[PDB]
Amino acid sequence: PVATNGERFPWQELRLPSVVIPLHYDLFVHPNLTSLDFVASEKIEVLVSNATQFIILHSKDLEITNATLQSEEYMKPGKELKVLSYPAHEQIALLVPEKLTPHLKYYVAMDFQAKLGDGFEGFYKSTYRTLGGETRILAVTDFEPTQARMAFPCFDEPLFKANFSIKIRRESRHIALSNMPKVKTIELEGGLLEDHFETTVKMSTYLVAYIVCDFHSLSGFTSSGVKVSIYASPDKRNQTHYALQASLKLLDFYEKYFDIYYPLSKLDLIAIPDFAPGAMENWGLITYRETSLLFDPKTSSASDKLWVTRVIAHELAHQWFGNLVTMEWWNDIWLNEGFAKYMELIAVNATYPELQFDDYFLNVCFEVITKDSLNSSRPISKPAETPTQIQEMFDEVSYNKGACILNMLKDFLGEEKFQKGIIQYLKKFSYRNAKNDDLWSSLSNSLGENAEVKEMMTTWTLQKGIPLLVVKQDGCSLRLQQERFLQGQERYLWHIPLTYSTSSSNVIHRHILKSKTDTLDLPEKTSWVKFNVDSNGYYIVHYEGHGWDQLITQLNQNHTLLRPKDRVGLIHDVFQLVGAGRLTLDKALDMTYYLQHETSSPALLEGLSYLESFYHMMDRRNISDISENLKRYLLQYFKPVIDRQSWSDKGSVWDRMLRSALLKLACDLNHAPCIQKAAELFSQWMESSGKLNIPTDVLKIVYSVGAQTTAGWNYLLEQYELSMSSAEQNKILYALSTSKHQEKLLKLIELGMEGKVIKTQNLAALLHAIARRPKGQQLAWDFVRENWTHLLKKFDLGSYDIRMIISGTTAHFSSKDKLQEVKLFFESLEAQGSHLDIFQTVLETITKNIKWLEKNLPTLRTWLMVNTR
Ligand SMILES: *[C@@H]1O[C@H](CO)[C@@H](O[C@@H]2O[C@H](CO)[C@@H](O)[C@H](O)[C@H]2NC(C)=O)[C@H](O)[C@H]1NC(C)=O
Ligand SMILES: *[C@@H]1O[C@H](CO)[C@@H](O[C@@H]2O[C@H](CO)[C@@H](O)[C@H](O)[C@H]2NC(C)=O)[C@H](O)[C@H]1NC(C)=O
Ligand SMILES: *[C@@H]1O[C@H](CO)[C@@H](O)[C@H](O)[C@H]1NC(C)=O
Ligand SMILES: *[C@@H]1O[C@H](CO)[C@@H](O)[C@H](O)[C@H]1NC(C)=O
Ligand SMILES: N[C@@H](CCCC[NH3+])C(=O)O
Ligand SMILES: [Zn+2]
């Protein structure tokens, strides 16, 4: 059946017919940034394979005002077309006056027009503030996955690749950028200019990009000769120096490591003021939030440098993983994002081992594990339909899990072989698509005894959840039993590569597992064993018997005898098993004693995290007596290291991150001295009128302290609008989130709604920040629940924005009462609401919360009191 105002639709499927295959777009956009809209024409060189009457492609909010098919053989210029718009599938069918013929090349041509978008999607309008307080406008695209069609009509599936020839018309006040380099710029009649860009290589629609704006750049060349340029508001060209250095080191590494050159003459990276994702891998023109690309030493901290390094690396890696080789469809999106998420590790560990991103990467893995230990989780690879569904596909799973099961795989196979694995894969599908199975098939084949790695990774990508491996030790035999891990089913098995160590030799014993159960014998009775070394593998281990107690003693006697990743891992698994019911809370809490001997910031920081977390559970909930004791326990223990910390920025990355960590905890716990220090720095900074320089590492801290007085918080807010640093602003915003006055918080949320002072793009993060504080957890929940309508105007569901605006304000709940209001709110969301897999997850998570409490609350109380004594 069909629409719009009559007639019927030749196609009842939201996928496009393979019959009409596109080979080339000729695309021309004439935007106006006063008019705030664009006119455009396109020209598509199709090729039919089966004769047909109609031609089917995507379009969304596009007014089409001319449609013609032309002929190469057949019909000279130019037969007219009958345009049929079926919005429910964001499609339009073309009607021909005569059957088309197989095996020949046609030309589809349309003129179309629209206003620039309001969103962060399609061909939208963004603004920024100048050093002089001027507000300026730019026009910009963001297409992944299904918004390419909101800009120009086209065959908008990742498989229909093509060459794109893009022409942009613009006033002289502006520049035009697009994926490719710029051939010529002809001056049109009355002043207006027109830019012609190099025809692209073959590539999917979601990767087309074009921008008009008046940014300035910083250019440089890679050893292999690409012109990397950094782009950003004119008053921000100084923040773009690091982006350049890194881009460069990083593209070099990639071309070498992948052994495949970056195809394009130049690569661009631009800092977009209003930008929803963190960044976008548009071939040859990658877009970034300012916080993901800009860096100013006066204002950007270590973690900052690390973050932007990360994302720059993550995005260059896409030029290969996704760009050059694209997953065939959205179910295997993980192929792009999981592989890119991983390569981050390799390249950054490669080019910047001083960031020690290695000791970090695990966090990626853990944090997903937290989400993959619920029934409401899913497989890395899963089928996808509605645009919305697809948007959901961009999550912690496709990213982190996919990235985690890759580093695990790499461990089993070895870098040498693994690296070889990918150079093959990439080279094989250069400039084309590839399937889920394709990856594995090309990795596992890097006689005649056969790499069956397939079967293995196949159980990983195709079933929900994560494995828990319990081990029993009776002298010299170990009972390895596997199960699905859950946080308080049947029918799951994993070809799960095991690893472990023994007290004696610190040598690594490997051994694969595929049967539900198996046993193994130990060449010498031993003290303790430790499965999953360096935590390089995607599963949990439980130690029944004295297995846990042994390892914990070891930790108190001589922890160095344990891998600092094993140490880090043990801490993870211990605390996770408490939730898993397998353990009692005192055992974990007890491990956390040896921490006064721990110097590995990774482990030390993890440890504290769990401690610091319970404090925040206790605090939200009114639960005074425990939060107050846990506060006292933290200030008391750990006081040595806490007292050692400097209000400077000296030391390695981990060193500075640990400082920020500690000094924060201290001040967040009202530690008399520390907060005096901060309050002083702030009062100097304010009364000196910005002049004083607060070290970037205590910056967020000082600001948030100073934020408690009405004087400060008002100066911080005004200072916010005036800041030329996204990073500072970021930290200021947080600092404004630490106020105790409801109205003050409410203000922020409104200012973020308005989107003038506080960019809408910050609304979720902001909400989330408030929701965490005791004071704001209600304010926040009221607001979302009360404004779901207007919010849904601002953002798509399910954008990461909506997805996070939902969980951010509710996932932290842990009472019966609230679990209802949420449960009931999600029922309510059921019109345009229903349905997001986040609805589920959030509930399951709130429940888990409630449980942990009743199950382990009292146990926490005593443990603390046992210390007081
Ligand atoms: C968008 O339209 C604006 C109209 O505001 C154009 O600017 C006008 O252009 C004509 C011819 O160039 C001039 O006579 C007017 O004086 C301009 N108005 C202003 C405020 O200067 C502009 O050319 C268009 N932009 C593009 C590149 O299409
Ligand atoms: C469209 O894109 C392709 C590349 O994606 C252009 O070139 C071919 O590129 C492949 C892969 O690098 C080379 O092996 C071929 O030698 C290239 N072919 C030719 C004839 O140059 C191709 O030229 C572009 N075609 C269009 C429609 O412009
Ligand atoms: C990181 O890089 C170093 C070389 O700088 C290498 O020795 C190490 O194995 C790498 N780590 C991993 C696990 O990729
Ligand atoms: C662990 O502790 C012992 C006893 O304090 C200490 O002598 C030693 O440095 C540690 N073991 C080694 C040599 O790593
Ligand atoms: N491709 C993006 C994700 C954006 C998804 C929404 N535009 C990335 O590398 O993170
Ligand atoms: Zn990505």
XYZ file of C-alpha atoms in Angstrom, residues 21-498:
478
model
C 22.635 -0.282 -8.547
C 24.335 3.147 -8.308
C 27.852 3.700 -9.577
C 28.357 7.413 -9.172
C 26.786 10.525 -7.670
C 27.262 13.952 -9.152
C 26.177 16.124 -6.266
C 25.871 19.895 -5.922
C 24.739 21.854 -2.889
C 24.012 25.566 -2.689
C 23.511 26.428 1.018
C 22.646 29.854 2.409
C 23.623 30.764 5.940
C 21.355 33.785 6.235
C 18.493 32.175 4.425
C 19.432 29.104 6.507
C 18.644 26.504 3.842
C 19.939 24.992 0.625
C 19.038 24.206 -2.955
C 20.638 21.264 -4.677
C 20.675 19.035 -7.745
C 22.144 15.539 -8.127
C 22.933 13.068 -10.934
C 23.081 9.305 -10.286
C 24.713 6.870 -12.762
C 22.650 3.754 -12.006
C 22.941 0.361 -13.669
C 20.077 -2.123 -13.866
C 20.533 -5.901 -13.617
C 16.897 -6.972 -13.925
C 14.495 -5.041 -16.157
C 12.089 -2.934 -14.096
C 9.355 -0.304 -14.185
C 10.281 1.807 -11.147
C 13.470 3.012 -9.419
C 13.664 2.931 -5.612
C 15.830 5.044 -3.254
C 15.723 6.933 0.091
C 14.658 10.509 0.881
C 13.578 12.337 4.037
C 12.216 15.860 4.338
C 13.327 16.669 0.835
C 11.187 18.719 -1.549
C 11.872 17.353 -5.030
C 11.240 19.760 -7.880
C 12.542 17.953 -10.975
C 13.139 14.322 -11.870
C 14.581 12.958 -15.102
C 16.143 9.760 -16.405
C 18.709 10.155 -19.181
C 20.256 7.617 -21.527
C 23.586 6.163 -22.588
C 21.944 3.112 -24.191
C 17.671 4.642 -24.596
C 16.634 8.280 -25.097
C 18.535 11.548 -25.699
C 18.232 14.263 -22.982
C 15.811 13.811 -21.266
C 12.700 11.913 -20.133
C 10.646 13.123 -17.134
C 9.955 11.026 -13.983
C 6.991 10.467 -11.624
C 7.964 11.038 -8.018
C 6.378 8.864 -5.325
C 7.055 9.679 -1.663
C 6.549 6.932 0.932
C 7.719 8.520 4.203
C 6.988 5.622 6.517
C 10.004 3.944 4.926
C 11.760 7.235 4.188
C 11.684 6.138 0.573
C 10.584 7.576 -2.741
C 9.890 5.521 -5.847
C 10.563 6.805 -9.335
C 8.159 6.013 -12.143
C 9.409 5.390 -15.677
C 7.225 5.644 -18.811
C 8.823 2.421 -20.073
C 10.361 -0.758 -18.679
C 14.112 -0.475 -18.144
C 16.552 -2.889 -19.704
C 19.105 -5.065 -17.891
C 22.866 -4.451 -18.107
C 22.778 -0.752 -19.094
C 23.798 2.562 -17.551
C 21.171 5.262 -16.871
C 21.248 8.758 -15.309
C 18.790 9.726 -12.530
C 18.592 13.453 -11.872
C 16.657 15.556 -9.370
C 16.508 19.085 -8.073
C 15.687 19.363 -4.398
C 15.622 21.835 -1.527
C 15.248 22.102 2.249
C 16.091 24.190 5.274
C 19.266 23.304 7.153
C 18.485 21.000 10.061
C 17.683 21.880 13.673
C 19.243 18.643 14.810
C 22.704 17.252 15.090
C 21.791 15.165 12.067
C 21.613 15.509 8.289
C 22.765 18.788 6.763
C 22.516 20.993 9.881
C 23.237 24.512 11.205
C 25.689 25.147 14.045
C 27.033 28.277 15.739
C 29.921 29.457 17.873
C 31.031 32.445 19.950
C 34.080 34.522 18.947
C 36.717 36.081 21.152
C 34.796 39.310 20.674
C 31.425 37.891 21.662
C 30.168 37.479 18.128
C 27.903 34.570 17.214
C 28.720 32.924 13.868
C 27.075 30.213 11.783
C 28.308 27.223 9.795
C 26.562 24.493 7.831
C 27.625 20.884 8.297
C 26.696 17.224 7.579
C 26.442 14.139 9.831
C 25.068 11.036 8.053
C 25.725 7.766 9.958
C 23.777 5.759 9.643
C 20.503 6.768 7.982
C 20.594 10.537 7.565
C 22.508 10.713 4.301
C 19.014 10.773 2.774
C 18.067 13.990 4.612
C 20.580 15.904 2.507
C 20.359 14.419 -0.956
C 18.129 11.619 -2.207
C 20.154 8.440 -2.616
C 20.517 4.701 -2.144
C 21.223 4.971 1.555
C 22.550 1.526 2.497
C 26.193 0.937 3.538
C 26.573 -1.548 0.692
C 25.671 0.652 -2.304
C 29.089 2.267 -2.640
C 30.040 4.819 -5.319
C 32.252 7.680 -6.406
C 30.999 11.100 -5.354
C 31.689 14.326 -7.228
C 30.753 17.241 -4.961
C 30.318 20.932 -5.826
C 29.549 23.638 -3.279
C 28.435 27.219 -3.814
C 29.410 29.831 -1.244
C 29.996 33.468 -0.374
C 33.612 34.624 -0.175
C 33.304 35.031 3.606
C 33.303 31.232 3.724
C 35.281 28.133 2.847
C 33.874 24.824 1.667
C 35.237 21.482 2.768
C 34.256 17.979 1.724
C 35.803 14.515 1.821
C 38.121 15.236 -1.065
C 40.664 17.930 -2.053
C 39.684 21.036 -4.039
C 40.352 21.097 -7.779
C 39.072 24.553 -8.687
C 37.082 27.558 -7.474
C 35.253 29.499 -10.192
C 33.783 32.916 -9.416
C 30.145 33.045 -10.438
C 28.287 36.112 -11.698
C 27.399 38.399 -8.801
C 30.306 37.480 -6.543
C 29.271 34.002 -5.410
C 31.939 31.303 -5.576
C 31.795 27.654 -6.499
C 34.144 24.872 -5.375
C 34.832 21.656 -7.245
C 36.275 18.725 -5.336
C 38.178 15.623 -6.405
C 35.862 12.737 -7.258
C 35.866 10.367 -4.274
C 36.955 6.755 -4.366
C 34.232 4.180 -3.965
C 32.556 4.582 -0.553
C 29.214 4.392 1.267
C 26.711 7.229 1.472
C 27.077 7.651 5.227
C 30.618 8.910 4.626
C 29.792 11.921 2.442
C 30.675 15.207 4.152
C 30.562 18.886 3.361
C 30.910 22.082 5.336
C 30.704 25.780 4.877
C 32.193 27.908 7.578
C 35.009 30.353 8.211
C 37.416 28.285 10.334
C 41.206 28.575 10.165
C 43.545 25.622 9.929
C 46.968 24.299 10.905
C 48.526 22.143 8.199
C 51.369 19.618 8.116
C 52.434 16.518 6.169
C 52.817 12.867 7.105
C 56.040 11.069 6.142
C 54.121 9.454 3.271
C 52.908 12.865 2.107
C 49.305 13.464 3.253
C 48.272 17.020 4.126
C 46.818 16.745 7.575
C 45.072 19.954 8.522
C 43.340 20.897 11.750
C 40.311 23.209 11.524
C 38.467 25.210 14.160
C 37.010 28.635 14.998
C 39.566 31.370 14.188
C 40.154 32.248 17.862
C 41.029 28.603 18.623
C 43.880 27.856 16.224
C 46.254 27.569 19.193
C 44.388 24.614 20.711
C 44.947 22.713 17.469
C 48.695 22.151 17.836
C 48.497 18.773 19.561
C 45.740 17.496 17.297
C 48.243 18.044 14.494
C 51.253 16.359 16.096
C 49.210 13.299 17.004
C 47.226 12.987 13.721
C 50.615 12.846 12.052
C 52.434 10.288 14.244
C 49.224 8.312 14.101
C 48.524 8.180 10.402
C 52.144 7.146 9.873
C 51.800 4.199 12.299
C 48.552 3.151 10.660
C 49.836 3.117 7.081
C 52.813 1.069 8.280
C 51.096 -1.266 10.706
C 48.215 -1.936 8.266
C 50.721 -1.837 5.421
C 48.061 -0.037 3.413
C 48.496 3.605 2.413
C 45.881 6.196 3.192
C 44.405 6.673 -0.362
C 43.665 10.395 -0.155
C 45.879 13.418 -0.834
C 44.779 15.115 2.405
C 43.109 14.373 5.711
C 41.137 16.983 7.591
C 40.052 17.194 11.200
C 37.629 19.868 12.263
C 36.219 20.997 15.589
C 32.448 21.361 15.273
C 30.778 23.554 17.968
C 27.497 21.620 17.857
C 28.271 17.949 17.357
C 26.364 14.985 18.765
C 28.737 12.070 18.493
C 32.247 12.347 19.904
C 33.563 12.370 16.320
C 32.778 11.155 12.771
C 35.083 9.257 10.485
C 33.969 11.012 7.260
C 36.687 9.902 4.842
C 39.132 12.766 4.423
C 37.071 15.058 6.601
C 36.665 13.817 10.150
C 34.484 15.839 12.476
C 35.044 16.174 16.228
C 33.468 17.784 19.233
C 35.818 20.475 20.414
C 36.502 18.448 23.559
C 37.675 15.560 21.386
C 40.209 17.477 19.348
C 41.216 20.800 20.890
C 43.758 21.031 23.690
C 45.083 23.982 25.642
C 47.868 23.268 28.169
C 46.704 26.076 30.424
C 43.347 24.386 30.743
C 43.519 20.780 29.550
C 44.613 18.076 31.987
C 46.374 14.736 31.506
C 43.271 12.610 31.133
C 42.222 15.221 28.603
C 45.371 14.795 26.501
C 44.764 11.072 26.763
C 41.104 11.266 25.721
C 41.701 13.355 22.614
C 44.717 11.249 21.740
C 42.394 8.271 22.036
C 39.645 9.617 19.803
C 42.022 10.985 17.176
C 43.521 7.524 17.010
C 40.092 5.906 17.037
C 39.007 7.960 14.062
C 42.118 7.552 11.910
C 41.722 3.803 12.445
C 38.301 4.074 10.797
C 39.896 5.325 7.562
C 40.796 1.648 7.295
C 38.249 -0.073 9.524
C 34.919 1.076 8.096
C 35.965 3.594 5.499
C 38.123 1.491 3.165
C 36.415 -1.732 4.265
C 32.762 -1.308 5.274
C 30.556 -3.816 7.065
C 27.835 -4.959 4.657
C 24.983 -3.972 6.992
C 24.265 -2.553 10.461
C 24.155 -5.875 12.304
C 27.913 -6.103 11.921
C 28.474 -2.451 12.773
C 30.729 -3.860 15.474
C 33.157 -4.605 12.632
C 33.772 -0.890 12.264
C 33.432 0.316 15.828
C 34.779 -2.691 17.763
C 37.870 -2.887 15.573
C 38.425 0.845 15.739
C 37.857 0.738 19.484
C 40.633 -1.832 19.712
C 43.188 -0.369 17.341
C 43.146 2.569 19.769
C 45.132 0.366 22.109
C 47.765 -0.738 19.604
C 48.436 2.631 18.004
C 48.411 4.747 21.160
C 50.467 2.208 23.050
C 52.664 2.425 19.965
C 53.042 6.159 19.370
C 52.470 7.382 22.940
C 53.460 4.679 25.432
C 53.928 7.489 27.956
C 50.163 7.848 28.237
C 50.266 4.223 29.321
C 46.869 3.800 27.752
C 47.571 0.092 28.301
C 47.007 0.119 32.049
C 43.763 1.855 31.124
C 42.254 -0.211 28.296
C 41.020 -2.819 30.793
C 38.478 -0.333 32.124
C 36.877 -0.352 28.693
C 36.527 -4.073 29.092
C 35.262 -4.166 32.665
C 32.708 -1.399 32.170
C 31.058 -3.396 29.357
C 31.197 -6.588 31.438
C 29.021 -4.704 33.907
C 26.378 -4.380 31.233
C 26.910 -7.830 29.766
C 26.141 -9.542 33.051
C 22.423 -8.836 32.627
C 19.677 -10.813 30.859
C 18.751 -7.561 29.073
C 22.061 -7.704 27.205
C 22.619 -8.772 23.614
C 25.208 -10.291 21.242
C 27.867 -8.244 19.485
C 26.269 -9.263 16.185
C 22.470 -8.836 16.036
C 19.977 -8.081 13.219
C 18.886 -4.449 12.694
C 15.914 -2.764 10.972
C 14.320 0.605 11.850
C 16.709 3.569 11.841
C 16.123 3.663 15.578
C 17.158 0.040 16.017
C 20.321 0.815 14.093
C 21.111 3.787 16.333
C 20.909 1.483 19.326
C 23.474 -0.721 17.618
C 26.086 1.935 18.502
C 26.649 0.871 22.109
C 29.110 -0.384 24.712
C 28.808 -3.867 23.137
C 29.615 -3.155 19.484
C 32.347 -0.922 20.753
C 33.990 -2.231 23.909
C 32.991 -5.889 23.886
C 33.957 -6.131 20.255
C 37.203 -4.397 21.154
C 37.742 -6.662 24.152
C 37.134 -10.040 22.449
C 39.579 -8.851 19.834
C 42.467 -8.271 22.248
C 41.643 -11.582 23.830
C 41.694 -13.274 20.420
C 44.964 -11.498 19.628
C 46.399 -12.972 22.816
C 45.623 -16.538 21.785
C 47.000 -15.993 18.263
C 49.840 -13.584 18.954
C 50.542 -10.096 17.596
C 52.791 -11.339 14.782
C 50.106 -13.655 13.446
C 47.284 -11.260 14.357
C 48.872 -8.274 12.669
C 49.303 -10.468 9.614
C 45.662 -11.426 10.009
C 44.406 -7.910 9.470
C 46.716 -6.781 6.657
C 45.152 -9.641 4.769
C 41.570 -8.769 5.756
C 41.934 -5.097 4.925
C 43.707 -5.739 1.621
C 41.140 -8.370 0.664
C 38.088 -6.094 0.862
C 39.742 -2.773 0.057
C 37.059 -0.402 -1.216
C 34.220 -2.858 -0.569
C 32.005 -4.536 1.993
C 32.559 -7.556 4.246
C 30.477 -9.848 6.453
C 30.759 -10.943 10.050
C 32.050 -14.372 9.090
C 34.489 -12.750 6.626
C 36.561 -11.241 9.430
C 37.100 -14.489 11.301
C 37.613 -16.456 8.086
C 40.441 -14.108 7.150
C 41.984 -14.023 10.634
C 41.888 -17.743 11.332
C 43.670 -18.267 8.000
C 46.914 -16.345 8.681
C 49.985 -28.671 7.549
C 47.518 -30.040 7.776
C 46.093 -29.155 11.177
C 43.427 -26.507 10.992
C 42.864 -23.225 12.751
C 39.295 -23.627 13.934
C 39.299 -20.202 15.507
C 36.023 -19.614 13.676
C 33.963 -21.851 15.995
C 35.413 -19.933 18.919
C 34.773 -16.315 17.997
C 31.439 -17.528 16.597
C 30.161 -18.431 20.052
C 31.369 -14.992 21.237
C 29.724 -12.688 18.709
C 26.508 -14.700 18.432
C 25.394 -15.154 22.027
C 24.562 -12.632 24.746
C 26.480 -12.485 28.037
C 29.903 -13.302 29.488
C 31.393 -16.590 30.843
C 32.067 -17.228 34.522
C 34.768 -19.853 35.095
C 34.719 -21.381 38.581
C 37.740 -23.458 39.601
C 38.084 -26.054 42.393
C 41.499 -27.088 43.713
C 42.098 -30.472 45.365
C 45.892 -30.748 45.553
C 46.893 -31.431 41.941
C 43.618 -31.542 40.015
C 41.467 -28.484 39.209
C 37.754 -28.730 38.389
C 36.999 -26.160 35.714
C 33.236 -25.621 35.492
C 31.851 -22.892 33.206
C 28.522 -21.024 33.398
C 26.818 -17.938 32.043
C 27.655 -15.042 34.334
C 24.695 -13.121 35.748
C 24.133 -10.522 38.435
C 21.273 -11.889 40.562
C 20.785 -18.748 32.562
C 20.835 -22.090 30.852
C 21.876 -23.024 27.302
C 25.243 -21.237 26.853
C 28.702 -22.547 26.019
C 31.952 -20.724 25.211
C 35.137 -21.882 23.460
C 36.907 -19.904 26.115
C 40.714 -19.758 25.975
C 41.998 -20.227 29.494
